[PDB]
């Protein structure tokens, strides 16, 4: 009980130390080809597990095409945790990232 | 009439050129006039009437430039020594080691002729914080940093290194390496930990800045 | 014209979920045995190449 509180404090301290604040973030404002691929795949996976959809799927049966529609209207509720070689990260939302 | 002497006068002058270029490249006050000294001016100032060069006369003192102290404040005076004896002994080397310590010199370049005694070579890292660097005059005939394939290597300050390790979130060793005994590393007189900035011409991007850590 | 004796589609196979070896628990070798198609080191390299980590997975 006492040894866990210290372990949790260290875990959350290291997390905060690695997190790059919204202002200090310096990566590409563009969503990488890889980011788009995973977002569309993961959101499709969520859609197939009866997750609340934020778009009107006009006769759409493919979850990926639904995930594609949600991306077009920037309604995908996901965040990209961009890691750097030291372990530090930049949290970028799907909404704010520029898509070609 | 000159059998082989004429060739040796030019080879020694060319080695003296490279040493002056090296001393200037490190950040010591050496004028462009002294570097661009012709063979005829060398013969009149450093060679006798008989036509023989006196290497003990070639030795000189170098002080850091105003620009070098504002980047490296712990950079001290430098002493260059051209040994007139073809084979450097344990007794001749001992006199040079004491010469640095007494005059409060921070760095000492020793240009030897043919070879150095294995016993004398042990006296080189025997007097810290003062550093001793040995160079063969035959290897100094041509400057390696003047070669088209050797880019501009610039030694970075403890602050410049600190900044580079921050921008890329790097650890000293996590960087590309340059050996402590690498020809250019020996030229600039690199110590372990010192980061060198390499401006290399690419046939894709043109001028490109890369870096290497001396270990 | 001459008709060559070979029937080129002799190695024609399809596997969804067939038998596996006890040690590796991986699809067993053998077209007629409902065996698996090997994804070798070069195909592994190609899937790393596209940066397509879920296809490799």
UniProtKB/Swiss-Prot annotation, chain A:
Highest taxon in the source lineage: Eukaryota
Alphabetical keyword list: Cytoplasm, DNA-directed RNA polymerase, Nucleus, Phosphoprotein, Ribosome biogenesis, Transcription
Membrane spanning residue stretches: none
One GO BP annotation of this record: nucleolar large rRNA transcription by RNA polymerase I
Gene Ontology CC annotations of this record: cytoplasm; nucleoplasm; nucleus; RNA polymerase I complex; RNA polymerase II, core complex; RNA polymerase III complex
Compartments, as annotated in UniProt: Cytoplasm; Nucleus
Keyword Transport on entry: no
Family classification: Belongs to the archaeal Rpo6/eukaryotic RPB6 RNA polymerase subunit family.
Name of the protein: DNA-directed RNA polymerases I, II, and III subunit RPABC2
Organism listed in the record: Saccharomyces cerevisiae (strain ATCC 204508 / S288c) (Baker's yeast)
Record lineage: Eukaryota, Fungi, Dikarya, Ascomycota, Saccharomycotina
Gene: RPO26
Residues included from the entire protein: 55 to 154 of 155
Swiss-Prot record, chain B:
Signal peptide location: none
Listed InterPro entries: Arch_Rpo5/euc_Rpb5, RNA_pol_Rpb5_N, RNA_pol_Rpb5_N_sf, RNA_pol_subH/Rpb5_C, RNA_pol_subH/Rpb5_CS, RPB5-like_sf
Record-level GO BP terms: nucleolar large rRNA transcription by RNA polymerase I; ribosome biogenesis; RNA-templated transcription; termination of RNA polymerase I transcription; termination of RNA polymerase III transcription; transcription by RNA polymerase I; transcription by RNA polymerase II; transcription by RNA polymerase III
Coarse class of the protein's main subcellular location: nucleus
Gene Ontology MF terms in the entry: DNA binding; DNA-directed RNA polymerase activity
Subunit structure: Component of the RNA polymerase I (Pol I), RNA polymerase II (Pol II) and RNA polymerase III (Pol III) complexes. Component of the RNA polymerase I (Pol I) complex consisting of 14 subunits: RPA135, RPA190, RPC40, RPA14, RPB5, RPO26, RPA43, RPB8, RPA12, RPB10, RPC19, RPC10, RPA49 and RPA34. The complex is composed of a horseshoe-shaped core containing ten subunits (RPA135, RPA190, RPB5, RPO26, RPB8, RPB10, RPC10, RPA12, RPC19 and RPC40) where RPA135 and RPA190 form the DNA-binding cleft.
Designated name of the protein: DNA-directed RNA polymerases I, II, and III subunit RPABC1
Curated annotation (Swiss-Prot), chain C:
Family: Belongs to the RNA polymerase beta chain family.
Extra facts: Three distinct zinc-containing RNA polymerases are found in eukaryotic nuclei: polymerase I for the ribosomal RNA precursor, polymerase II for the mRNA precursor, and polymerase III for 5S and tRNA genes.
Reported function: DNA-dependent RNA polymerases catalyze the transcription of DNA into RNA using the four ribonucleoside triphosphates as substrates. Component of RNA polymerase I (Pol I) which synthesizes ribosomal RNA precursors. Besides, RNA polymerase I has intrinsic RNA cleavage activity. RPA190 and RPA135 both contribute to the polymerase catalytic activity and together form the Pol I active center. In addition, subunit RPA12 contributes a catalytic zinc ribbon that is required for RNA cleavage by Pol I.
Compartments where found: Nucleus, Nucleolus
Subunit details: Component of the RNA polymerase I (Pol I) complex consisting of 14 subunits: RPA135, RPA190, RPC40, RPA14, RPB5, RPO26, RPA43, RPB8, RPA12, RPB10, RPC19, RPC10, RPA49 and RPA34. The complex is composed of a horseshoe-shaped core containing ten subunits (RPA135, RPA190, RPB5, RPO26, RPB8, RPB10, RPC10, RPA12, RPC19 and RPC40) where RPA135 and RPA190 form the DNA-binding cleft. Outside of the core, RPA14 and RPA43 form the stalk that mediates interactions with transcription initiation factors and newly synthesized RNA.
Organism: Saccharomyces cerevisiae (strain ATCC 204508 / S288c) (Baker's yeast)
TM annotation in the entry: none
Protein name as annotated: DNA-directed RNA polymerase I subunit RPA135
């Amino acid at each position: 009980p006492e040894d866990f509180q210290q372990h949790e404090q260290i875990r959350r301290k290291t997390l905060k130390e690695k997190a790059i604040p919204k202002d200090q973030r310096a990566t590409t404002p563009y969503m990488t080809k890889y980011e788009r691929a995973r977002i569309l795949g993961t959101r499709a996976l969520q859609i197939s597990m009866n997750a609340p959809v934020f778009v009107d799927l006009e006769g759409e049966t493919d979850p990926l095409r639904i995930a594609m529609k949600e991306l077009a209207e920037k309604k995908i509720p996901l965040v990209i945790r961009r890691y750097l070689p030291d372990g530090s990260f930049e949290d970028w939302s799907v909404e704010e990232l520029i898509v070609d | 009439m000159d059998q082989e002497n004429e060739r040796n006068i030019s080879r020694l002058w060319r080695a003296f050129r490279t040493v002056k270029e090296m001393v200037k490249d490190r950040g010591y006050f050496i004028t462009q006039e002294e570097v661009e000294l012709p063979l005829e001016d060398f013969k009149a100032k450093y060679c006798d009437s008989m036509g023989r060069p006196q290497r003990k006369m070639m030795s000189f003192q170098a002080n850091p430039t105003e620009e070098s102290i504002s980047k490296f404040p712990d950079m001290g005076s430098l002493w260059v020594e051209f040994c007139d004896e073809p084979s450097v002994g344990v007794k001749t080397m001992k006199t040079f080691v004491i010469h640095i310590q007494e005059k409060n010199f921070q760095t000492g370049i020793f240009v030897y002729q043919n070879n150095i005694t294995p016993s004398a070579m042990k006296l080189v890292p025997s007097i810290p914080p003062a550093t001793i660097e040995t160079f063969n005059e035959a290897a100094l005939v041509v400057n390696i940093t003047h070669h088209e394939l050797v880019p501009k290597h610039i030694r970075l300050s403890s602050d410049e290194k600190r900044e580079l390790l921050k921008r890329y979130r790097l650890k000293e060793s996590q960087l590309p390496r340059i050996q402590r005994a690498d020809p250019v590393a020996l030229y600039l007189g690199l110590k372990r930990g010192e980061v060198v900035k390499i401006i290399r011409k690419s046939e894709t991007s043109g001028r490109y800045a890369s870096y290497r850590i001396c270990m | 014209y001459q008709r060559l004796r070979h029937m080129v589609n002799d190695k024609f196979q399809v596997r969804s979920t067939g038998p596996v070896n006890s040690l590796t628990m991986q699809p067993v070798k053998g077209r007629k045995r409902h065996g698996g198609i090997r994804v070798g080191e070069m195909e592994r390299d190609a899937l790393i190449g596209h940066g397509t980590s879920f296809l490799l997975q």
